[PDB]
Amino acid sequence: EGIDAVYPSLVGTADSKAEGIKNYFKLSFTLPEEQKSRTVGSEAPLKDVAQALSSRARYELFTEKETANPAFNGEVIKRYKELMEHGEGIADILRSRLAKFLNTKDVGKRFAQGTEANRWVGGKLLNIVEQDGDTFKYNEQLLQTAVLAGLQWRLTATSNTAIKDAKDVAAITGIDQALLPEGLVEQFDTGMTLTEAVSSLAQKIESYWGLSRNPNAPLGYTKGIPTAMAAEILAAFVESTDVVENIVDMSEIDPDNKKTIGLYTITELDSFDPINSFPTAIEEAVLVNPTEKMFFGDDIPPVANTQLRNPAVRNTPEQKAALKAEQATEFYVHTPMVQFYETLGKDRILELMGAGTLNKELLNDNHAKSLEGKNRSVEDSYNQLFSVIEQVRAQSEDISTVPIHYAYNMTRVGRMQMLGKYNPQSAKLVREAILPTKATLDLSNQNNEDFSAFQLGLAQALDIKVHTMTREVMSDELTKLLEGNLKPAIDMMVEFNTTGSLPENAVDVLNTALGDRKSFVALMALMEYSRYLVAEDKSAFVTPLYVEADGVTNGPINAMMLMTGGLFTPDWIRNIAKGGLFIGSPNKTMNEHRSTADNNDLYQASTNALMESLGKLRSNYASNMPIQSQIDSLLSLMDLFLPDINLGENGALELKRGIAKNPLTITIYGSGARGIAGKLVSSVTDAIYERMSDVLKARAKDPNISAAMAMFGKQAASEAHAEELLARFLKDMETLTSTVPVKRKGVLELQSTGTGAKGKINPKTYTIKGEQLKALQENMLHFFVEPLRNGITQTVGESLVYSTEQLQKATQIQSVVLEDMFKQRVQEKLAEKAKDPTWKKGDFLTQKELNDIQASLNNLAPMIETGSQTFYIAGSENAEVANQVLATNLDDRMRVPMSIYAPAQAGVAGIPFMTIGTGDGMMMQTLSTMKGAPKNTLKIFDGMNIGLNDITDASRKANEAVYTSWQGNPIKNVYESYAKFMKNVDFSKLSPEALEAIGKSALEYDQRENATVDDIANAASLIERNLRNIALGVDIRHKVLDKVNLSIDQMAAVGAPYQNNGKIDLSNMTPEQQADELNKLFREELEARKQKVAK
DNA sequence: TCAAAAGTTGCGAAGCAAC
Q: What angle do the packed helices A847-855 and A798-833 form, to 10 degrees?
């Protein structure tokens, strides 16, 4: 009588083994102990809620609160009266759609005679209907509560959607990642797919119903009934033009595939709509514990219990203390920046910091697609920021004294991420209007220690490398700028402060003054400096300007220290000092290192190594004229359209550090050679398309110009020079796209593809795609990426790349077994339910049964524990296991497959998990919970913003967190889990397909052709012993380094290093002598451990 | 390379065939 008394008129009995029609709504949901929604028990939820939104007094009575939100004023109330009236029209559409369903093919007649039409995939919505004479009808309470959830979804769905990159789009369309056409990635980010639109809508409907799931009920009904309602509601929104549905077929570009995907977009509201100032009135009136809201003053967000997108993993007690600390920080609004934005306007913001207005006639088709993509990001963040200001402004008269709190969560890689899409952590436009930092400096004298802190904030914002020069040098360079190029822009800003108006040529003045330093933080620097000039009391200046303590190549430096074994080498000592680890130099900062000792970083060192490898490759084929010409053509082509590569008149090749930035970062994350080659070619093609646009522009100005001058005029001294460069571009393009190199027996041969690029170029429709793109990627892969990888390996060392190889092999093998066992166990269960008279194929399993299968995998160690973090590499949500439809709508459309939480193959994802989680992920967690942790800071990944009053103390603490995180042992954590897996595994019970996959990671090509199960088992145990040796070597290295004096300056902005107070002096020694001293301590530690085992 | 997942529709009432 718990749920059978609330809904007594629903069709069918509530017995799982009855004879007639059974009601699976009452067999799957139970009333909660304490109420969660205020719509349970009402008769007309659409009228009860609409009554509560008609006044301020009624809203407080319904919600049982002393005072409502101050933003709930008269204008918002009127806008909410039209929304409810619009919601009554959506309900009428749903009621009429059902009656049509029951009238076709006599579905209603058959269902009344005993046919179980409520168990079909397309008829699961018959479990919430009631009899009415000779026909059926909806249940008013359940239907109207679903419409209320639909109206709230229509207002906030867009701002909560996720971000899909090129990798995600490839998985949807099925095309290869490296050959994704132009504009396809950004097209899929405008709208939402069917799976993500229905799933997000279904979650809202279930929450508003306020019931609990039954653990012993099938997953096809506890998840299908809410989903069948979501598809019907979305169909009604399309009919009402509130949602636009678009169908895109992939056969127009790739004839091979036949996929046809549909995209949905929500019609947006006006930027001046009063409803944007308080868009969550419905949610807070229905849910006892709302989720979508904004927190002011003493409202502190709650702490989450499970990892983001990972319900099986719980946040450790140490990780929960970090979330609590970061959610207590108060954010404030900077009024002068907000007034500058609205006076400038949205159109002028796009012109300045975006692409401005676009003339599609005078642009290339591929160029114009990219330009439109960059305009959307700036416009979306502008609209989001100013909708927040409207809500903040109603709280009090002074907008700058209203505290703001934000909610965080733990990502699956161990990072702390803000919730939302456009927040201070993610959007750079919003970063300069909402700050947690503040200061009160004394700037009456220019020689004060407070003025030097003020200059450091301005210099860094204006793109000056403040961590490579001393304080006196930085001050000199800033003064040259403030009285040179930047003077006209500062003068305009001074007049704006006193008057409040801007000139008509504001964009021209800022573009001319800033130039290549243009950014959002560069505008704040001009605003703060011009505010200081006009101030009358300079001894108490209050500013929110900040200084960021960025990490110098945080990625590669972390990996080189956490995953290197064996003895010390003089090259490791030299290269590790470029990241900020100094041995034998007390109180040494990075400003002193770069100024006197070495002015190169890891990016510059790798480029120097690449040049050495390139010369070796060139001389290797000194007698191969066809090969030599192919290498020359590739380098000539990249010279024209890339600023980092230049060709001398004598053939000398000079490279800059720009080309080694992206490849070095992604090589650490385990990216293959094919990924780097695809990215490098993409940069070259983008520059080519931009050049074709200039041809169109020059032709319009003068239609009698020559082709060579219209394209290379800006880079040619005379007409003859332009003609020469045009010939090079034509010849190089046809050479690379005709013949490609193929590697076999270890040497390279030239093979003709027969698809050379010939014809006349059209500037409007010029495009490189298909077999022409693949030829370009083959030349770059075998002539530029292979030498590049050799150079990177030399700088980071061969010992580091050996640790990453074993790490990837162990995780891939373990994940393969976990996935195969999971599938093998759900098939045995489904074969037992086949003998159940009351079970129908399609209900799948229950939640209790799914937990039992997962709980049987605990002896294979699916999770890696470091003592303060937990990682689950193999977890995913795939629809392959279920392999059936969950629910459709009444029109036999919008079919949604069933997805469950099941393990999947890892691949190369093992390397990023350990490098990021135990690296900057662990360091930031330490920083928040350590003793005397800094306050009022914004902690971006591998960075931190600090107020001007405590730059010195907070920087020292930041270096101490880095030192603490450098004592971790990621290889030891993997070894402990892999040792337990090899103790309880049984290789003889694996499927033949799984055995082949294991052999691809544990055996060589010539040995895995006809391997047995004993060969695979034996080869897998050798990896276990390889991981044991690496972990022992890393452990000894950290103990030896703790005995000597060190200085840590990884965050190099300010110049405050941390000391490890060792008691062994390694000063006045060369790097060769220091390596000998450390190797002596390595052997003393090793011998002591071995004697302990013997004794 | 890490931070989620991925086609649509007739016929008949599940799952293959057509595009």
A: 140
